[PDB]
Design a protein around this motif. Structure first.
Motif, PDB file in Angstrom:
ATOM      1  N   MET C 141      32.249  78.088  12.663  1.00 38.34           N
ATOM      2  CA  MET C 141      32.646  78.030  11.272  1.00 38.34           C
ATOM      3  C   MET C 141      32.695  79.453  10.728  1.00 38.34           C
ATOM      4  N   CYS C 142      33.671  79.724   9.868  1.00 39.79           N
ATOM      5  CA  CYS C 142      33.686  80.981   9.140  1.00 39.79           C
ATOM      6  C   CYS C 142      32.731  80.923   7.958  1.00 39.79           C
ATOM      7  N   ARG C 143      32.112  82.054   7.622  1.00 47.91           N
ATOM      8  CA  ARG C 143      31.138  82.092   6.530  1.00 47.91           C
ATOM      9  C   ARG C 143      31.761  82.124   5.134  1.00 47.91           C
ATOM     10  N   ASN C 144      33.010  82.567   5.042  1.00 53.34           N
ATOM     11  CA  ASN C 144      33.709  82.640   3.761  1.00 53.34           C
ATOM     12  C   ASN C 144      34.788  81.576   3.641  1.00 53.34           C
ATOM     13  N   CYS C 145      35.728  81.547   4.586  1.00 52.40           N
ATOM     14  CA  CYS C 145      36.749  80.510   4.570  1.00 52.40           C
ATOM     15  C   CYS C 145      36.154  79.124   4.764  1.00 52.40           C
ATOM     16  N   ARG C 146      34.999  79.030   5.417  1.00 56.73           N
ATOM     17  CA  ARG C 146      34.438  77.744   5.822  1.00 56.73           C
ATOM     18  C   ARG C 146      35.433  77.030   6.731  1.00 56.73           C
ATOM     19  N   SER C 164      39.691  88.089  13.837  1.00 53.84           N
ATOM     20  CA  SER C 164      40.101  87.760  12.481  1.00 53.84           C
ATOM     21  C   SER C 164      40.771  86.397  12.498  1.00 53.84           C
ATOM     22  N   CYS C 165      40.504  85.610  11.462  1.00 51.80           N
ATOM     23  CA  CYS C 165      41.067  84.278  11.360  1.00 51.80           C
ATOM     24  C   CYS C 165      42.561  84.329  11.121  1.00 51.80           C
ATOM     25  N   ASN C 166      39.830  87.928   1.690  1.00 56.94           N
ATOM     26  CA  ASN C 166      39.533  88.564   2.969  1.00 56.94           C
ATOM     27  C   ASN C 166      38.110  88.214   3.429  1.00 56.94           C
ATOM     28  N   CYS C 167      37.938  88.015   4.745  1.00 51.27           N
ATOM     29  CA  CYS C 167      36.637  87.772   5.357  1.00 51.27           C
ATOM     30  C   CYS C 167      36.099  88.943   6.157  1.00 51.27           C
ATOM     31  N   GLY C 168      36.961  89.847   6.597  1.00 47.66           N
ATOM     32  CA  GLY C 168      36.547  91.019   7.322  1.00 47.66           C
ATOM     33  C   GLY C 168      36.273  90.668   8.769  1.00 47.66           C
ATOM     34  N   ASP C 170      34.018  90.044  12.233  1.00 47.43           N
ATOM     35  CA  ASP C 170      32.846  89.201  12.439  1.00 47.43           C
ATOM     36  C   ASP C 170      32.689  88.211  11.294  1.00 47.43           C
ATOM     37  N   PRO C 171      33.602  87.255  11.136  1.00 39.42           N
ATOM     38  CA  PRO C 171      33.457  86.235  10.085  1.00 39.42           C
ATOM     39  C   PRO C 171      32.821  84.931  10.537  1.00 39.42           C
ATOM     40  N   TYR C 172      32.351  84.856  11.777  1.00 36.45           N
ATOM     41  CA  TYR C 172      32.105  83.597  12.467  1.00 36.45           C
ATOM     42  C   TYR C 172      30.626  83.451  12.785  1.00 36.45           C
TER      43      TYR C 172
HETATM   44 ZN   LIG Z   1      37.695  83.571   8.201  1.00 38.13          ZN
END
Ligand SMILES: [Zn+2]
Ligand SMILES: Nc1ncnc2c1ncn2[C@@H]1O[C@H](COP(=O)(O)OP(=O)(O)O)[C@@H](O)[C@H]1O
Ligand SMILES: Nc1ncnc2c1ncn2[C@@H]1O[C@H](COP(=O)(O)OP(=O)(O)O)[C@@H](O)[C@H]1O
Lengths: 92, 242, 602, 97, 399
Positions: C141-146, C164-165, C166-168, C170-172
């Motif tokens: 799961m992404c921490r921002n996009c969920r 990368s799937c 802004n989340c920057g 390492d979003p996972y």
């Molecule tokens: Zn993301």
């Protein structure tokens, strides 16, 4: 190569001279001689068979093997064995 | 020497090949002998090597040889050391449409033919994306009839590919893109040569269609199936026990 | 193309056959009932069937292998539904297994050629490090996009997470509770120490394995293996290692107490033919030492022994030693060493030692600590290696006192205890004992006291139920008899061929009797009769009052020799699979014990 | 169970007896040995195989080697007027082999 | 834990095994309060990390705060803050069931507040926990290994094994105490007991009476501003070399409310520890649980006392009567308790005992130790036949 054999042709002389000297041992000696030696003389016999590279045991080299173990036991003992010097030479 | 022959025979993608491998050899030699020429990653070290070795022998060709920052640097350094269709009036090149045709891994001969078509008849245009679209589509339908003849799952995948390679959700324009070029390119001897080569004729063979259309009932509409089909379908139920 | 090869492979699955019976087809049908998700394979079987896969699996194996995995899963998927339609959602890839015998190549003759190919070999094992895990399917799961996603990995237990799937970057996060993993270990190897140069230390190599190719092995087990000479990371260099793709072990090298206990059915019928013969005892006596002469009475004890006896427990815990204890005693020759050499062969899971402990061999539990973490572990024991077995000893004379003590305790309770600084032990021995003697200068002991060999005059006549002067006084013809009994061994094989023709008659070879022993050792439920009670209470009081006088004459007796024949008689009846006992063998009992009392006199 | 100078490679060397399981193992000054280094050679000429019970590893091998040795008599000279085991302080059970 | 593999990772486990070493207690941060002395206000911040719960919650790299949003100062309340304990321990098999000849298969375990002070080395274990494993080793970052196999727990159980300083500590009922108050008021019970103790074997009734009164033991009174006075009792026996003694040892072993066993000879650890702790948690030196000391309220089993040199006979004098050890090794000069009781066993020099001869010249000990033990009972095996006629019967009667 060579695993040369032994033919049961006159081997009961083994049984003969063994029983002979196994009694002659008590005749004047303290310790015995035991089948350990006999097994070893057979191993020496096949040893010299591998040495000569002959096909199997020869009879007139068992004389060598047994002479060796004989004069092995000779020097291994007291001066009391000095009578075994005269007794157990016929097997030479 | 493997890598040398590799990068040297990378130019196509008599005396030439020979003299050029010799050239690159003694060139690399001269460049590495002295202590003068260093920090030159071997990552790239057989390219303007090859370009100047083209410059040396006899005839040289500026195009299709250099094909960048340090390309110039090392050159001087050595040389001293010694949608798509609403868009109106677009422009294209040889290699732009070599790309759009080589995306199907089609041969280069067909691509050169579309290129000739263009550079002669790219004059009176509105949008060349249509013309080259239709062109390469009617290359695909003619050469790819076998796999499609046995796999109707292809015709959706292919049209979907070119629907989004040129960014549309509507497609009937693409249908027109095919039939109009087919109206146009219909009767040239080279098109003819391709049709005898890869044998579509509307996607159907000659020795069949002529009896389809002259007036016959022996015409084999293969509703029935062929014998080898069943010969191999039987194996699927042979092991039906498991 | 690749699917051509896939079909050339999958035809080998169900369209292969030899000896007119499908092999791998029903192997899978069984394995799936086992819920195993793997198989076994030979690659010899593929060479004749097809040459379109061999020469390319050789040099590009990893390119070809997961294909086979997927083909296997494909076959599985049909047969799963078909067998559900027959009788009575989540079906992962099946580990493949295979083997070979084409050749063996040693570590020494390797090079940096034929790397990433497949190679065959020999060696010896060390490591049993740890169950290190890897992943196979793990949710993200992404921490921002969920923004949920998912990943699965295949073989290499190439890529990493998405950047990368802004989340920057390492979003996972990696979710665990809906993720999946597998196990491997790091397994070592080293060559035959007998085939090495004179000088240098040896060279070893690591390897890795996976799910059901795990935990097959424990060190010392000589094994052959086939694998892929893979790589991972002076001037610029990568470490050589190997990927397993085939292991084969000797079925059971050094004797495993976790042995076989469920025997086949075909053997029961001949077992019970041998149960019901009356010649059982006499055959066993004719055959335990076929190249050996006389001392019938001595060979007549071993069969009482190996079968054990009355495991009897009572509601306090004071068990009785189910087995019996013995002591040969006598001179050079007289076969005192040869039987002991033999008995391990006939034995299923027992052990042999010399005295004092042997080289790198604790005669009891020689505890020490771990090379890693410096922690305590019970290491070894010649008395616990053989739990539920016999033990063979020579040169009992030169014990160490600390060495003698615990063994001196085993033979009456068979349970060692160690309570050093931190560790507190009660480790069960549960073993039987074979001794062997060194008479001082041999024979004059019969002229002398019972003892006058060594300074344990106590334990000799105390902790032993079979003690025998083992000699004849150089009868001039027994020598010739034993000599001609034995000379035929060395060539002519007449002593061996006699055993051949007598096993064709009424004798048994080594392993049939081994299995007979194992079976009865763990099967029977013996007991003795009240009727047989008094028969030897009378014998006991009589031998007591008898040697009271003759030992009061200024020349041992124990409750233990009373309690001993209790169990020897049950053993000899046990041979006939006897839940009861009668005098039939009680007579043989004292027939054989009397040798002990005759020695007891002298 | 020996270390190695390189990278701590645990290895299993054996006595030179082990090396010539087909061949032969020479020795000089047999006397000059403690408990366990004697028990080992005893085991060798007894059942021609070693055992180990240490270090998470258990095993036997083939020790069918030919033995040779030497030693030094007590007092330089042999003491002609006595038997062997009475003169030199060796023990018999390995002497018998 | 020789068997716990990747298979059934997340599935609740119960493992039976041993303790090896532990980790020192460490109260630990749940919430860091920071105070605003400009108004009389507080500001509360709290943390968390991977190992408080199993659900992979979204992480928070939180940092120690110095300032406020206004930019004022901040002050702490080390004492209104809330912290919490933690322990990790390593667990491997029960050594009884081992594949003797092979290494153990130890793993790591972690705990919370409620469930840490119950453990020690030399303890038998059973747990209820989770074989989680967490991390991202090699997945996201870069370069080979994977995860860090371990357990978290929800329940733990120790209990008894033979040879450990610990009781099974059995329970009773209203009916059990009913039966015992019934048992008490019957006016032969010590005698009927004394024959009921080891009904396996006959005779030695005087002696099993004494085993009984030893495990009953004294009272071990102490002194108002004084040293302690003994309650425990110890027994010794010598006799002819094949009587009930060594079997009687094993008998008495399981019988007791507590029990530990010895073989006889043993140096530097019979009641010692050697005072060397391998610590990487720090460079420090502590003790480990000593063996004789591992008894505190029970009885100990000793035999072959004869083969023990003086080097421990000397060591025992304060231990039989004065029951305590204090030592002076390079590191430490501290005190420990060994309030134990003992049983011995002997073998004389000449096989047996003769009463025409003295009962003293063949034991071969100091009269000190003869006095040290409370009681010495001797045993003989001089022959008769009626002396064993019925013994034969009873033995056969109870096979
Ligand atoms: Zn993301
Ligand atoms: N009773 C016997 N009958 C036949 N051969 C025997 C007998 N005893 C010993 N041997 C043989 O003599 C050799 C010596 O072995 P053995 O006598 O068992 O060892 P030791 O003499 O050290 O006790 C062996 O090879 C064995 O085959
Ligand atoms: N007084 C006795 N009466 C009957 N049986 C006994 C007596 N003493 C010992 N036994 C039996 O004889 C066996 C001998 O063991 P034991 O003599 O206790 O070993 P140790 O002599 O080493 O203590 C015991 O298992 C027990 O069943």
């Amino acid at each position: 190569k060579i695993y040369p054999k032994l033919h049961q042709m006159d081997m009961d002389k083994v049984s003969r001279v063994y029983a002979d000297l196994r009694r002659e041992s008590i005749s004047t000696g303290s310790f015995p001689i035991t089948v350990r030696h006999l097994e070893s003389i057979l191993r020496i016999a096949e040893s010299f068979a591998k040495m000569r590279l002959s096909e199997f045991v020869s009879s007139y080299d068992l004389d060598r093997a047994i002479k060796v173990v004989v004069d092995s036991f000779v020097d291994a003992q007291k001066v009391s064995v000095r009578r075994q010097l005269r007794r157990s030479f016929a097997i030479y | 020497q493997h890598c040398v022959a590799e990068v040297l025979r990378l130019d196509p993608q008599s005396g030439y090949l020979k003299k050029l491998t010799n050239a690159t050899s003694i060139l690399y030699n001269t460049s590495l002998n002295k202590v003068m020429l260093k920090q030159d990653e071997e990552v790239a070290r057989c390219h303007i090597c090859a370009y100047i070795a083209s410059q040396k022998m006899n005839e040289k060709h500026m195009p299709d040889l250099c094909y960048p920052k340090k390309a110039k640097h090392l050159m001087n350094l050595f040389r001293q050391s010694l949608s798509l269709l609403v868009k109106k009036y677009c422009k294209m090149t040889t290699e732009e449409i070599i790309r759009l045709c080589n995306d199907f891994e089609l041969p280069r001969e067909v691509a050169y033919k579309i290129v000739d078509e263009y550079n002669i008849n790219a004059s009176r245009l509105v949008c060349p994306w249509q013309l080259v679209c239709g062109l390469v589509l009617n290359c695909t339908f003619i050469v790819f009839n076998e796999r499609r003849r046995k796999d109707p799952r292809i015709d959706h995948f292919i049209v979907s590919k070119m629907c989004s390679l040129m960014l549309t959700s509507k497609v009937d324009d693409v249908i027109e893109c095919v039939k109009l070029v087919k109206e146009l390119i219909i009767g040239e001897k080279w098109f003819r040569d391709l049709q005898i080569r890869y044998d579509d004729f509307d996607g159907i063979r000659y020795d069949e269609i002529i009896f389809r259309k002259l007036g016959s009932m022996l015409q084999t509409t293969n509703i029935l199936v062929t014998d080898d089909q069943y010969n191999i379908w039987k194996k699927r139920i042979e092991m039906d026990l498991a | 193309d690749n699917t051509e090869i896939i079909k050339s492979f999958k035809n080998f699955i169900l369209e292969f056959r030899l000896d007119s019976q499908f092999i791998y087809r029903d192997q899978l049908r069984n394995n799936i009932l086992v819920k195993n998700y793997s198989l076994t394979v030979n690659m010899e079987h593929l060479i004749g069937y097809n040459e379109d896969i061999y020469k390319k699996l050789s040099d590009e194996p990893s390119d070809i292998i997961p294909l086979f995995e997927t083909a296997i899963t494909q076959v599985a998927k049909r047969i799963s539904i078909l067998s559900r339609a027959q009788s009575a959602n989540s079906l992962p890839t099946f580990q493949l297994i295979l083997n070979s015998n084409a050749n063996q190549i040693p570590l020494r003759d390797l090079d940096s050629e034929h790397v990433s190919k497949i190679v065959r070999l020999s060696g010896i094992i060390i490591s049993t490090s740890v169950l290190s895990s890897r992943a196979t399917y793990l949710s993200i799961m992404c921490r921002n996009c969920r923004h949920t996603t998912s990943i699965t990995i295949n073989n290499f237990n190439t890529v990493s997470l998405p950047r990368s799937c802004n989340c920057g970057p390492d979003p996972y996060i990696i979710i665990h509770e809906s993720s999946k993993f597998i196990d491997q270990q790091f397994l070592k190897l080293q060559e035959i120490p007998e085939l090495v140069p004179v000088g240098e230390m040896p060279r070893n190599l690591t390897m890795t394995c996976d799910r059901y190719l795990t935990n097959k092995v424990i060190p010392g087990t000589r094994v052959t293996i086939v694998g892929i000479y893979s790589i991972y990371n002076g001037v610029a260099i990568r470490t050589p290692y190997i990927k397993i793709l085939g292991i084969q072990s000797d079925v059971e090298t050094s004797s495993i107490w976790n042995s076989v206990t469920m025997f086949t059915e075909e053997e029961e019928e001949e077992f019970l033919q041998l149960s019901r013969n009356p010649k059982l005892y006499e055959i066993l006596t004719n055959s335990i030492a076929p190249s050996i002469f006389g001392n019938e009475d001595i060979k007549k004890a071993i069969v009482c022994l190996l079968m054990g006896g009355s495991k009897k427990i009572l509601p306090d815990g004071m068990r009785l030693r189910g087995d019996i204890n013995v002591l040969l005693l006598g001179d050079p020759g007289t076969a005192k060493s040869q039987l002991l050499k033999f008995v391990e062969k006939v034995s299923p899971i027992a052990v042999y030692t010399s005295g004092k402990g042997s080289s790198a061999a604790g005669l009891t539990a020689s505890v020490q600590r771990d090379p890693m973490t410096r922690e305590f572990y019970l290491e070894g024991g010649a008395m616990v290696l053989a739990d539920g077995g016999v033990v063979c000893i020579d040169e009992f004379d030169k014990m160490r006192d600390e060495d003698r003590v615990a063994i001196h305790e085993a033979m009456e309770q068979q349970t060692i205890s160690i309570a050093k600084a931190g560790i507190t032990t009660v480790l069960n021995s549960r073993t039987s004992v074979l001794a062997a003697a060194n008479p001082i200068y041999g024979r004059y002991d019969d002229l002398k006291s019972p003892g006058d060999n060594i300074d344990f005059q106590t334990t000799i006549l105390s902790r032993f139920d079979m003690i025998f002067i083992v000699k004849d006084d150089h009868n001039e013809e027994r020598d010739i008899s034993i000599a001609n009994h034995v000379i035929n061994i060395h060539t002519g094989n007449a002593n061996a061929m006699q055993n051949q023709q007598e096993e064709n008659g009424s004798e048994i070879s080594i392993e049939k009797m081994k299995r007979y022993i194992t079976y009865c050792r763990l099967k029977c439920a013996p007991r003795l009769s009240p009727q047989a009670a008094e028969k030897l209470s009378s014998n006991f009081v009589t031998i007591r009052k008898q040697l009271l006088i003759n030992e009061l004459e200024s020349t041992p007796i124990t409750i233990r020799q009373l309690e001993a024949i209790i169990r020897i008689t049950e053993s000899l009846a046990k041979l006939e699979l006897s839940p009861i006992a009668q005098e039939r063998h009680v007579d043989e009992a004292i027939r054989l014990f009397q040798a002990s009392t005759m020695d007891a006199a002298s | 169970v020996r270390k190695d100078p390189i990278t701590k490679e645990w290895t299993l060397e054996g006595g030179a007896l082990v090396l010539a399981d087909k061949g032969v193992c020479l020795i000089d000054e047999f006397d000059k040995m403690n408990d366990q280094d004697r028990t080992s050679i005893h085991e060798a000429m007894e059942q021609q195989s070693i055992s180990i019970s240490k270090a998470g590893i258990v095993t036997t091998l083939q020790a069918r080697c030919s033995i040779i040795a030497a030693a030094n008599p007590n007092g330089g000279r042999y003491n002609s007027t006595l038997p062997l085991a009475q003169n030199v302080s060796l023990t018999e059970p390995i002497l018998s082999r | 834990p020789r068997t716990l593999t990747a298979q059934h990772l997340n599935k609740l486990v119960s493992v039976e095994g041993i303790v090896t070493k532990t980790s020192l207690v460490r109260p630990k941060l749940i919430r860091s309060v920071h105070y605003a002395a400009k108004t009389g206000r507080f500001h509360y911040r709290d943390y968390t990390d991977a190992t408080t719960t199993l659900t992979t919650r979204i992480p928070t790299p939180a940092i120690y705060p110095t300032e406020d949003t206004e930019g004022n100062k901040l002050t702490t309340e080390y004492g209104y803050s809330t912290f919490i304990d933690h322990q990790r321990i390593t667990v491997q098999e029960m050594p009884e069931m081992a594949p003797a000849g092979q290494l153990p298969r130890s793993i790591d375990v972690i705990l919370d507040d409620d469930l840490v002070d119950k453990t020690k080395p030399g303890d038998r274990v059973n747990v209820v926990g989770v074989f989680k494993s967490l991390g991202a080793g090699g997945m996201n970052q870069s370069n080979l290994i994977g995860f860090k196999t371990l357990i978290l727990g929800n329940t733990v159980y120790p209990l008894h094994a033979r040879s450990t300083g610990v009781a099974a500590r059995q329970m009773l009922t209203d009916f059990d105490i009913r039966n015992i108050n019934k048992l008490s008021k019957k006016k032969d019970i010590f005698d009927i007991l004394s024959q009921s103790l080891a009904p396996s074997i006959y005779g030695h009734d005087h002696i099993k009476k004494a085993i009984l009164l030893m495990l009953m033991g004294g009272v071990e009174k102490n002194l108002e501003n004084g040293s302690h006075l003994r309650g425990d009792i110890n027994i010794l026996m010598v006799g002819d070399p094949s009587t009930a003694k060594s079997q009687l040892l094993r008998f008495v072993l399981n019988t007791a409310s507590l029990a530990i066993a010895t073989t006889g000879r043993g140096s530097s650890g019979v009641g010692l520890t050697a005072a060397v702790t391998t610590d990487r948690e720090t460079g420090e030196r502590r003790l480990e649980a000593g063996a004789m000391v591992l008894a505190d309220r029970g009885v100990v089993c000793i035999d072959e006392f004869d083969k023990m040199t003086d080097v421990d006979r000397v060591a025992i004098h304060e231990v039989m009567e004065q029951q305590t050890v204090t030592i002076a090794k390079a590191g430490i000069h501290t005190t420990l308790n060994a309030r134990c009781s003992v049983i011995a066993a002997a073998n004389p020099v000449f096989g047996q005992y003769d009463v025409n001869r003295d009962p003293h010249q063949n034991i071969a000990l100091p009269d000190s130790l003869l006095s040290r033990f409370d009681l010495l009972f001797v045993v003989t095996d001089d022959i008769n036949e009626i002396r064993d006629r019925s013994i034969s019967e009873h033995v056969l009667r109870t096979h």
